[PDB]
Amino acid sequence: SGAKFRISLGLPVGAVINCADNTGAKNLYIISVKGIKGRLNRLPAAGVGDMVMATVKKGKPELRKKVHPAVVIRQRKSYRRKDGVFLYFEDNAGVIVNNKGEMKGSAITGPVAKECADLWPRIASNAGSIA
Amino acid sequence: MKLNISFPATGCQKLIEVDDERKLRTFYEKRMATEVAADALGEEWKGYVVRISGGNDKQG
Amino acid sequence: MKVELCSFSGYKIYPGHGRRYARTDGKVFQFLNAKCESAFLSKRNPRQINWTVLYRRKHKKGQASLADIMAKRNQKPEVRKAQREQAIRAAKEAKKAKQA
RNA sequence: CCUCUGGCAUGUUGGAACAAUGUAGGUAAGGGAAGUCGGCAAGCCGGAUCCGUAACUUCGGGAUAAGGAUUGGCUCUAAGG
RNA sequence: UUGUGGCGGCCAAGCGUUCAUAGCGACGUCGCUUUUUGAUCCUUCGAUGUCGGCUCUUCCUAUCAUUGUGAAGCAGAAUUCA
RNA sequence: GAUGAUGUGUUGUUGCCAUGGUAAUCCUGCUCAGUACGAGAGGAACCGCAGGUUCAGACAUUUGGUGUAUGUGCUUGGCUGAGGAGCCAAUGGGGCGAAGCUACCAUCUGUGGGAUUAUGACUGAACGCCUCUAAGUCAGAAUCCCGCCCAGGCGGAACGAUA
RNA sequence: CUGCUUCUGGGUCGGGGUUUCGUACGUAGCAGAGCAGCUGCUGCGAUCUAUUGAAAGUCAGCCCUCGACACAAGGGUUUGU
RNA sequence: GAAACUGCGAAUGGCUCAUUAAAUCAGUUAUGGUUCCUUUGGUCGCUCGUACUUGGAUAACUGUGGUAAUUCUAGAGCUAA
RNA sequence: UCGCACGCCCGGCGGCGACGACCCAUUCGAACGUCUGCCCUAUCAACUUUCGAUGGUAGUCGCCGUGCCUACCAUGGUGACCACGGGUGACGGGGAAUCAGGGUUCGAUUCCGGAGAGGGAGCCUGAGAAACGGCUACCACAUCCAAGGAAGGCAGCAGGCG
Ligand SMILES: Nc1nc2c(ncn2[C@@H]2O[C@H](COP(=O)(O)OP(=O)(O)O)[C@@H](O)[C@H]2O)c(=O)[nH]1
Ligand SMILES: [Mg+2]
Ligand SMILES: [Mg+2]
Ligand SMILES: [Mg+2]
Ligand SMILES: [Mg+2]
Numbered sequence: 021s022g023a024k025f026r027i028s029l030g031l032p033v034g035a036v037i038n039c040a041d042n043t044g045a046k047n048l049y050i051i052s053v054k055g056i057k058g059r060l061n062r063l064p065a066a067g068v069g070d071m072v073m074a075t076v077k078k079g080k081p082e083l084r085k086k087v088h089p090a091v092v093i094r095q096r097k098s099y100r101r102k103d104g105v106f107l108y109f110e111d112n113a114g115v116i117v118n119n120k121g122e123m124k125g126s127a128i129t130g131p132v133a134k135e136c137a138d139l140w141p142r143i144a145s146n147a148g149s150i151a
Numbered sequence: 152m153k154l155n156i157s158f159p160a161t162g163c164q165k166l167i168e169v170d171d172e173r174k175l176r177t178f179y180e181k182r183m184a185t186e187v188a189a190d191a192l193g194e195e196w197k198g199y200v201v202r203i204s205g206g207n208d209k210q211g
Numbered sequence: 212m213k214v215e216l217c218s219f220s221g222y223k224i225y226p227g228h229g230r231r232y233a234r235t236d237g238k239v240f241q242f243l244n245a246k247c248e249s250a251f252l253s254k255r256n257p258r259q260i261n262w263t264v265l266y267r268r269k270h271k272k273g274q275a276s277l278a279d280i281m282a283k284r285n286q287k288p289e290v291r292k293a294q295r296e297q298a299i300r301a302a303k304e305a306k307k308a309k310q311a
Numbered sequence: 312c313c314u315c316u317g318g319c320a321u322g323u324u325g326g327a328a329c330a331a332u333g334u335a336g337g338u339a340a341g342g343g344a345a346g347u348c349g350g351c352a353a354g355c356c357g358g359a360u361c362c363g364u365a366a367c368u369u370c371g372g373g374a375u376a377a378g379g380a381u382u383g384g385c386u387c388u389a390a391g392g
Numbered sequence: 393u394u395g396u397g398g399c400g401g402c403c404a405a406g407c408g409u410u411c412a413u414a415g416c417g418a419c420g421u422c423g424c425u426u427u428u429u430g431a432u433c434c435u436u437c438g439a440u441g442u443c444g445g446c447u448c449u450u451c452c453u454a455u456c457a458u459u460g461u462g463a464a465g466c467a468g469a470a471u472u473c474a
Numbered sequence: 475g476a477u478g479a480u481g482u483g484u485u486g487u488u489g490c491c492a493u494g495g496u497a498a499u500c501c502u503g504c505u506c507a508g509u510a511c512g513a514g515a516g517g518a519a520c521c522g523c524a525g526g527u528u529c530a531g532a533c534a535u536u537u538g539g540u541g542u543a544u545g546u547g548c549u550u551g552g553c554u555g556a557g558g559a560g561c562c563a564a565u566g567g568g569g570c571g572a573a574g575c576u577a578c579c580a581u582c583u584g585u586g587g588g589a590u591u592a593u594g595a596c597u598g599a600a601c602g603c604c605u606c607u608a609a610g611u612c613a614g615a616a617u618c619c620c621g622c623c624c625a626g627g628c629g630g631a632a633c634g635a636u637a
Numbered sequence: 638c639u640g641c642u643u644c645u646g647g648g649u650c651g652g653g654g655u656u657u658c659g660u661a662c663g664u665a666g667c668a669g670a671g672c673a674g675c676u677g678c679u680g681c682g683a684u685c686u687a688u689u690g691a692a693a694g695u696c697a698g699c700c701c702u703c704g705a706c707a708c709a710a711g712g713g714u715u716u717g718u
Numbered sequence: 719g720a721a722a723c724u725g726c727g728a729a730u731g732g733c734u735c736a737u738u739a740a741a742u743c744a745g746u747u748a749u750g751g752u753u754c755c756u757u758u759g760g761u762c763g764c765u766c767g768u769a770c771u772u773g774g775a776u777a778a779c780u781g782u783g784g785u786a787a788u789u790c791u792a793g794a795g796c797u798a799a
Numbered sequence: 800u801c802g803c804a805c806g807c808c809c810g811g812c813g814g815c816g817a818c819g820a821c822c823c824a825u826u827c828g829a830a831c832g833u834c835u836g837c838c839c840u841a842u843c844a845a846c847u848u849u850c851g852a853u854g855g856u857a858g859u860c861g862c863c864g865u866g867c868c869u870a871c872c873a874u875g876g877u878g879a880c881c882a883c884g885g886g887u888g889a890c891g892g893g894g895a896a897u898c899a900g901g902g903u904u905c906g907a908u909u910c911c912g913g914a915g916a917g918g919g920a921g922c923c924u925g926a927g928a929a930a931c932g933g934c935u936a937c938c939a940c941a942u943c944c945a946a947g948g949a950a951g952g953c954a955g956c957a958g959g960c961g
């Protein structure tokens with residue numbers, strides 16, 4: 021019901037982030053974000069909770085050379101929650117997620133922020149600790 | 152939030168429930184097993200000083 | 212509002228201020244300001260830095276019904292030794308019957 | 312780079328301001344060439360000591376290949392005539 | 393100037409299971425445009441700086457989307473024509 | 475963009491609006507609703523609600539940048555006999571940094587009317603009936619114009635003080 | 638855009654408030670790897686502990702002062718219905 | 719005599735043969751280089767300094783419960799070795 | 800500390816036991832030690848070392864001996880008699896098949912020893928465990944859920960997929 025508030029985005033096109041799930045993929049190179057119109061000379065950027073499109077740059081052989089939709093899990097750009105805290109994470113992170121929301125993985129390493137765990141309810145169930 | 156009150160001087164007990172917090176910050180931000188005065192609780196609670204002795208969380 | 216405490220220094224973080232850090236292993240660390248944040252990410256012990264709180268606590272600067280129970284309880288000991296005497300009236304006569 | 316002997320008055324003018332645009336220095340969160348014809352420019356590495364060093368080859372090289380660790384101050388000890 | 397390029401009409405053989413014209417449209421035919429290339433050489437040879445890209449404003453409509461609408465071989469969803 | 479000019483007797487305060495400019499945009503999620511429609515498969519809308527993209531205007535509490543308060547510590551080479559206190563090295567270097575600037579990299583805000591276009595209709599002839607049109611009449615829109623907002627005319631007004 | 642004698646006003650200095658950095662010099666210490674000179678003592682010794690959230694800066698465009706100190710009834714040029 | 723505290727067992731047994739090439743394992747000797755519940759047999763007034771029975775907790779149990787859920791257990795109250 | 804029969808001196812002596820114990824035996828052993836013994840490969844000929852390799856001294860630790868570890872010294876140890884490395888579709892052995900005499904092949908398999916409970920690691924109690932029909936982590940897999948959490952380990956007997 022309640023939609024997702026605006027948080028500061030700090031992952032433009034061309035960022036490799038940690039593929040933190042149990043597929044075997046270890047990188048996610050962001051190729052484009054889903055939902056971005058953008059203006060002239062504007063990199064489509066993503067933040068926490070923004071389901072994105074990525075390519076695995078390092079990992080298993082059968083997960084590379086192919087575009088996977090993904091979902092950003094952690095960023096280290098300090099985004100602002102509405103209750104007044106500037107949270108940020110240690111590293112950037114993401115899991116591999118099909119178009120319906122369900123993960124290709126089965127487990128998620130480390131924390132998932134609440135801004136993604138509320139928006140993607142099946143990433144939240146595989147999450148060890150939230151925010 | 153339920154409160155299991157107990158009289159150890161003869162050894163009986165029963166359970167009450169209250170659902171407002173300006174009656175309940177007399178308990179909050181303490182340790183376990185400190186002495187708090189229950190005189191800020193209500194109409195029948197005058198002269199009663201009490202031990203909070205710990206209890207179960209929302210998940211038990 | 213929850214008025215939390217800074218992880219490096221240990222002052223009292225108010226709701227608008229501060230900054231929140233979350234590592235890859237849980238461990239959500241609060242910070243009052245970037246003076247504390249830089250000194251935490253540089254991995255500095257607070258116990259060696261003179262302005263915090265964990266320094267100053269280290270260096271110690273600053274500062275049968277009850278009626279019957281009570282009825283037998285309050286009983287006077289000459290009545291008790293007389294009761295001991297009719298216990299003797301049982302026992303020594305019974306032991307004369309033991310040998311007899 | 313700093314100083315002593317020696318030399319000089321800032322290189323054909325001064326004063327008051329610290330706007331734009333420059334020229335010359337710098338610094339930047341998150342991302343890291345997505346900019347652009349092109350990593351242009353900037354940046355990264357950098358000395359020394361102890362390790363370690365591949366393919367290839369005219370056997371000489373490559374080679375400081377690459378990749379690591381240490382480096383301050385103070386107090387000693389040992390060895391070198 | 394408009395061959396050529398682009399765009400749009402008219403007439404109706406036929407396509408559209410049926411049915412010319414929902415959407416198309418043969419043979420023919422009438423036009424518009426200067427975002428193509430030709431044609432000409434009037435202007436410029438006592439020099440109007442000759443490709444692209446970046447930046448930036450403004451304009452056209454021959455509309456891709458958005459607002460309101462009319463039409464379908466429009467049930468809804470999608471999509472075509474206006 | 476910045477002074478200023480004419481006269482209004484000179485000056486000052488408070489204003490008016492002639493005129494120019496003009497601005498907001500599009501989308502997603504909840505609900506409607508697995509409902510209308512449909513054999514199914516699928517599958518919307520109107521009013522509401524919560525947010526977002528692009529845009530415009532700001533602003534500094536908070537977060538981030540900057541940082542020569544050359545503010546405070548640490549520190550290399552040298553120099554003042556040494557300490558202390560300091561200086562030079564075209565800002566020596568590096569932490570941390572107040573104020574001020576500043577960032578969708580933080581935060582706030584972004585409007586209402588009128589005649590109408592296309593179109594759908596009303597009464598109603600032409601043309602006994604019919605007809606949205608001929609006379610008359612209604613609804614009508616990201617358009618147009620005005621509002622809101624920016625500037626304020628060789629354009630005015632009210633009011634004070636007038637050596 | 639402001640201020641410039643109602644015993645009032647601004648201005649300088651001082652004081653507090655705020656804040657930044659991080660605990661001053663001196664002194665003391667049977668704290669200090671150790672070393673040296675005298676027979677347990679005295680000197681050298683980076684650093685540490687106490688004094689000490691100390692010291693230092695803080696409006697030049699920060700906040701209150703009612704403490705001190707002087708200043709402030711002026712100068713010049715034009716304007717008439 | 720249910721329940722519960724205490725003692726004991728749960729390191730045997732059963733399965734499989736992944737690892738391991740002087741390792742395992744096999745014959746051989748050593749432990750004068752070590753431990754060893756148990757079972758049996760020795761020692762068990764050898765010491766020269768309230769004992770007619772010393773103490774206070776705890777379980778079962780009564781009672782009040784919490785958790786969505788576990789062979790989760792919380793506060794209270796009695797009581798033995 | 801506990802139980803059964805119960806007597807004798809004029810309160811004190813007493814019976815049969817049961818349990819529990821320091822230490823020495825004994826038993827079940829375990830544990831490192833000594834000698835000798837194993838398939839294939841040289842398209843593995845030098846390996847081992849300040850990252851203990853082989854020794855000496857003194858300690859730590861252990862239940863003990865021991866470079867097992869630490870400090871200081873010595874420069875050693877193994878190898879053409881195959882060291883070292885690699886392979887094993889290799890647990891070793893008692894044994895099994897075939898067989899004149901020799902052999903060659905097999906031995907996961909019920910007896911003995913060892914190793915291991917998905918893979919490594921670490922520990923509690925206990926005399927005995929680096930136990931897994933114990934616990935704690937991480938890795939891999941995987942069950943319930945109100946999304947806050949919980950619990951698990953068939954190479955034990957059946958049984959299921961693969
Ligand atoms: N409003 C309403 N809906 C109903 C009723 N009974 C069934 N439904 C709805 O019918 C829909 C389809 O029903 P379902 O049993 O799933 O379909 P089925 O299995 O083919 O019968 C569901 O969304 C139900 O909620 C009713 O009595 N009233
Ligand atoms: Mg571009
Ligand atoms: Mg100069
Ligand atoms: Mg000069
Ligand atoms: Mg940067």
Ligand SMILES: [Mg+2]
Nearest residue numbers: 339340341342
């Ligand atoms: Mg950075």
Ligand SMILES: [Mg+2]
Nearest residue numbers: 061345346347
């Ligand atoms: Mg490009």
Ligand SMILES: [Mg+2]
Nearest residue numbers: 344345346347
């Ligand atoms: Mg490019």
Ligand SMILES: [Mg+2]
Nearest residue numbers: 350351352353
């Ligand atoms: Mg270059």
Ligand SMILES: [Mg+2]
Nearest residue numbers: 373374376377
């Ligand atoms: Mg090279």
Ligand SMILES: [Mg+2]
Nearest residue numbers: 406407408411
């Ligand atoms: Mg036909």
Ligand SMILES: [Mg+2]
Nearest residue numbers: 433434435436
């Ligand atoms: Mg010509």
Ligand SMILES: [Mg+2]
Nearest residue numbers: 436439440441
């Ligand atoms: Mg020109």
Ligand SMILES: [Mg+2]
Nearest residue numbers: 453454455474
């Ligand atoms: Mg048109």
Ligand SMILES: [Mg+2]
Nearest residue numbers: 493494495620
């Ligand atoms: Mg206007």
Ligand SMILES: [Mg+2]
Nearest residue numbers: 508514516517
């Ligand atoms: Mg249905």
Ligand SMILES: [Mg+2]
Nearest residue numbers: 509510511512
């Ligand atoms: Mg139906």
Ligand SMILES: [Mg+2]
Nearest residue numbers: 534535536537
């Ligand atoms: Mg700020």
Ligand SMILES: [Mg+2]
Nearest residue numbers: 245538539571
């Ligand atoms: Mg800063």
Ligand SMILES: [Mg+2]
Nearest residue numbers: 540541572573
């Ligand atoms: Mg700042």
Ligand SMILES: [Mg+2]
Nearest residue numbers: 557558559560
């Ligand atoms: Mg000095």
